[PDB]
Scaffold this active site. Structure first.
Site, PDB file in Angstrom:
ATOM      1  N   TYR A 113      67.396 -10.136  65.159  1.00 48.05           N
ATOM      2  CA  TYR A 113      66.196 -10.029  64.338  1.00 48.05           C
ATOM      3  C   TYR A 113      66.497  -9.649  62.892  1.00 48.05           C
ATOM      4  O   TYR A 113      65.602  -9.179  62.182  1.00 48.05           O
ATOM      5  CB  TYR A 113      65.226  -9.021  64.955  1.00 48.05           C
ATOM      6  CG  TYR A 113      64.482  -9.536  66.167  1.00 48.05           C
ATOM      7  CD1 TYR A 113      63.628 -10.627  66.069  1.00 48.05           C
ATOM      8  CD2 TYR A 113      64.629  -8.928  67.405  1.00 48.05           C
ATOM      9  CE1 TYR A 113      62.945 -11.099  67.173  1.00 48.05           C
ATOM     10  CE2 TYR A 113      63.952  -9.392  68.515  1.00 48.05           C
ATOM     11  CZ  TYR A 113      63.111 -10.479  68.394  1.00 48.05           C
ATOM     12  OH  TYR A 113      62.432 -10.944  69.497  1.00 48.05           O
ATOM     13  N   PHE A 153      57.601  -3.440  60.822  1.00 49.47           N
ATOM     14  CA  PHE A 153      57.560  -3.306  62.273  1.00 49.47           C
ATOM     15  C   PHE A 153      58.889  -3.640  62.942  1.00 49.47           C
ATOM     16  O   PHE A 153      58.934  -3.773  64.169  1.00 49.47           O
ATOM     17  CB  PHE A 153      56.449  -4.188  62.851  1.00 49.47           C
ATOM     18  CG  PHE A 153      56.498  -5.614  62.380  1.00 49.47           C
ATOM     19  CD1 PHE A 153      57.274  -6.551  63.042  1.00 49.47           C
ATOM     20  CD2 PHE A 153      55.766  -6.018  61.275  1.00 49.47           C
ATOM     21  CE1 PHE A 153      57.321  -7.862  62.611  1.00 49.47           C
ATOM     22  CE2 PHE A 153      55.810  -7.328  60.840  1.00 49.47           C
ATOM     23  CZ  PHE A 153      56.587  -8.251  61.509  1.00 49.47           C
ATOM     24  N   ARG A 176      58.131 -24.346  71.569  1.00 48.71           N
ATOM     25  CA  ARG A 176      57.155 -23.640  70.745  1.00 48.71           C
ATOM     26  C   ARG A 176      55.743 -24.134  71.002  1.00 48.71           C
ATOM     27  O   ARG A 176      54.798 -23.337  70.996  1.00 48.71           O
ATOM     28  CB  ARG A 176      57.499 -23.784  69.264  1.00 48.71           C
ATOM     29  CG  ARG A 176      58.971 -23.665  68.956  1.00 48.71           C
ATOM     30  CD  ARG A 176      59.211 -22.626  67.882  1.00 48.71           C
ATOM     31  NE  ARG A 176      58.248 -22.733  66.794  1.00 48.71           N
ATOM     32  CZ  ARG A 176      57.701 -21.695  66.175  1.00 48.71           C
ATOM     33  NH1 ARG A 176      58.006 -20.453  66.510  1.00 48.71           N
ATOM     34  NH2 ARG A 176      56.830 -21.911  65.194  1.00 48.71           N
ATOM     35  N   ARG A 188      51.254 -17.943  75.754  1.00 46.72           N
ATOM     36  CA  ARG A 188      50.643 -16.831  75.039  1.00 46.72           C
ATOM     37  C   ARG A 188      49.126 -16.893  75.127  1.00 46.72           C
ATOM     38  O   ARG A 188      48.470 -15.868  75.338  1.00 46.72           O
ATOM     39  CB  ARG A 188      51.101 -16.831  73.583  1.00 46.72           C
ATOM     40  CG  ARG A 188      52.539 -16.398  73.395  1.00 46.72           C
ATOM     41  CD  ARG A 188      52.899 -16.294  71.928  1.00 46.72           C
ATOM     42  NE  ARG A 188      54.282 -15.878  71.738  1.00 46.72           N
ATOM     43  CZ  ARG A 188      55.176 -16.549  71.026  1.00 46.72           C
ATOM     44  NH1 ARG A 188      54.866 -17.683  70.420  1.00 46.72           N
ATOM     45  NH2 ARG A 188      56.410 -16.071  70.918  1.00 46.72           N
ATOM     46  N   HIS A 205      59.564 -15.011  73.719  1.00 45.49           N
ATOM     47  CA  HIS A 205      60.151 -15.340  72.430  1.00 45.49           C
ATOM     48  C   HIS A 205      60.896 -16.661  72.547  1.00 45.49           C
ATOM     49  O   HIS A 205      61.540 -16.937  73.560  1.00 45.49           O
ATOM     50  CB  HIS A 205      61.102 -14.233  71.948  1.00 45.49           C
ATOM     51  CG  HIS A 205      62.004 -14.655  70.831  1.00 45.49           C
ATOM     52  ND1 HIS A 205      61.643 -14.557  69.505  1.00 45.49           N
ATOM     53  CD2 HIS A 205      63.255 -15.175  70.843  1.00 45.49           C
ATOM     54  CE1 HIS A 205      62.631 -15.001  68.748  1.00 45.49           C
ATOM     55  NE2 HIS A 205      63.620 -15.383  69.536  1.00 45.49           N
ATOM     56  N   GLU A 247      71.274 -18.322  68.478  1.00 49.14           N
ATOM     57  CA  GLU A 247      70.872 -17.400  69.534  1.00 49.14           C
ATOM     58  C   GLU A 247      71.645 -17.642  70.825  1.00 49.14           C
ATOM     59  O   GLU A 247      72.001 -16.687  71.522  1.00 49.14           O
ATOM     60  CB  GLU A 247      69.370 -17.512  69.782  1.00 49.14           C
ATOM     61  CG  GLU A 247      68.524 -16.859  68.706  1.00 49.14           C
ATOM     62  CD  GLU A 247      67.146 -17.475  68.592  1.00 49.14           C
ATOM     63  OE1 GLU A 247      66.827 -18.369  69.401  1.00 49.14           O
ATOM     64  OE2 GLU A 247      66.383 -17.067  67.693  1.00 49.14           O
TER      65      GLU A 247
END
Lengths: 149, 149, 149, 149, 149, 149
Positions: free
Chosen positions: F50, F58, F86, F103, F116, F127
């Site tokens: 990240y 945050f 996505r 979601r 994610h 990743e």
């Protein structure tokens, strides 16, 4: 309550898209997932696993079939998990498994049973120690434990 | 054909989000929903309900657990509904309920069996009279009754 | 976070056995069920509810259809619950609701939209106070609140 | 492995929208669909089919009910398909079919059993030849046969 | 209200076991099944069907792929059925179909779009008359028509 | 066609029993599972992951929440898999995700988005290299590839 079982989804269950449906069944039953990993099982590992049924005419065929594709190996934790896992999985011979189980829902033949599960609380530990490293066994606390036990 | 049963979803099954899955099972089986309401069961009501098992070591624990959260109480009407509801619910002890039932799908422990059902056609009427007012029991005719019966 | 919405399943959706499927959708979205109750809607109650659309040619037909069978009235609590409920329910006109919603999955005609939902956070409170008594609104704490918010 | 069975969804099972849920059950079990058609069964055809139970008090009622709406007739091919189909369908008397089957999930009465299946490998062929023309039986190879068998 | 559409499940959707999941979607939306049959589409029939897109580089490939296995052809009747069926099916190009549709759920490539549907109310009749004989179109009344319209 | 994406189920979606439902969605869409593993993500790993959103208020809260429980990390392979993942996952902000997505079905708050996914074909490879060892990426051939493509 800390009892654990070993379940392995076989390449038949992997190329048929059955990984999600079984995981949902276990999760909705309420067992806590401890380990999950996705390998290509090696023949030496399979022989060490199936030394119990090694002295059978179909042992070589079983090993050759199992080392064809990838397997999904999972560890589930809960109360009477070893026996409840066999109850949910059903009987191995498809002419004996009732509807509502996993084999009784997705199985037609005995030479491929799509799923494999530990029989006793000793074989379960023997399989977990054989397949999973001790560092790959997550020990968390679920938010539904108060509403399971 | 006008036989009615009493089903109560316990707070164990309410905090686990199991209200919809059970209502779907009963509706797709084909029983007609007569009453449905959502309360916090009072201890006096629970004692009057469980006076049958009052003389048991776990009666106080059962009452204290069931007066913790809200219960979903419903009345279902149909042919042999009282016995069919117990068949669908399954056996209380999780080491005896088969897959395909409700307890055999969502239950691990006997102390929290998520769901409760009337045993006999007399206990069913007793529980309906005890829990529901006679004015909260809708009597309509379904559009599929001519096919169900 | 304590925002509440009013959802009513119409008799059209009650005779079609759609009560469980909608409750599951809301529960799996993650809203907390506060009130649930199963009544036969009275014409005066329906007129007080639909005074907003009273000055329409189809108001009398709407009232007559709604007072034909029983309705399932529920109250759901959560963050942005009023707007998320309309999003999940979809648009009223069936030629506009997308698949994946409730109307877009189970609706063909506008005269019987199976489900009704509050439009704004003021109409939601007006409907809750009009339909449910304040004592029938259970205020508990779910076990998944830490994993929702 | 070329064994075939005959399954017929009755007009009660067509009016209740149960055609998809049964086809998905058979497909996920793993049998290969060979024939499918949607007709209105003629009384002579029904009498030829049910000559076995002709000498019963309910034969006339059965024929009259069956010639009321349309039937969905399918042929499924696989290993032990005739016996496995009866196991999945469950027992005819609803007070005997367990949950997880088709009758045990969607059946309440004996006079309408939503679904009908061949009992033996001879009756299966007798029904296939009686109901389907030999040209309406597709013989293809599925992409998952190498795993199923 | 008597409007009819033509839907065809392609061999890609037949060997993937998708016949039941689509029929259930249409049935739960509420359309009335009028015709259903299971054939191996002939090349002349496919050329007559696809003469609209004949003058395309992929027409020969489309015909050769479609005459490889068997297809499931159905006719559905209802209000705005032709447009609603296209909405439910989704867009042909997989990079444009949203989740919740059929293509958006089960499709990855444009060359195998699992399902085909009529575009207009004239093409629908042209396809129904081309594929189904007028005697194989059942005209019954469902028990839920009062709660659809 | 060999494109790969990275999906991670967060502890929020692990304690809610959502692992099976997402895997079923991806499998039924038709993507080929390449890697699957179940670990407790370390804070250094999360910071390396990240660093893109490190300069946000945050970020610390995100890292602390993510290193609370175990994550399910998987790699899916297919055509346009990165963008299709996505699309299936939906928008991050719950007030924008439509029903039918993941979601939009299981998410209420942005601080806990349960799932994610990689944004671009470069971030996906980054990743995968960051999380999975090259030896834990099974390269098999599914039995439905000849139909999907």
């Amino acid at each position: 309550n800390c009892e654990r079982t070993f379940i392995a989804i076989k390449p038949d269950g992997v190329q048929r898209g059955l990984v999600g449906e079984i995981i949902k069944r276990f999760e909705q039953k309420g067992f806590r997932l401890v380990g999950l990993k996705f390998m290509q099982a090696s023949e030496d590992l399979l022989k060490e696993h199936y030394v119990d049924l090694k002295d059978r005419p179909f042992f070589a065929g079983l090993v050759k079939y199992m080392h064809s594709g990838p397997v999904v190996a999972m560890v589930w934790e809960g109360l009477n998990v070893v026996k409840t896992g066999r109850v949910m999985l059903g009987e191995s011979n498809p002419a004996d498994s009732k509807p509502g189980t996993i084999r009784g829902d997705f199985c037609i033949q005995v030479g491929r049973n799509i799923i494999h599960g530990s029989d006793s609380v000793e074989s379960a530990e023997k399989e977990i120690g054989l397949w999973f490293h001790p560092e790959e066994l997550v020990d968390y606390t679920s938010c539904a434990q108060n509403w399971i036990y």
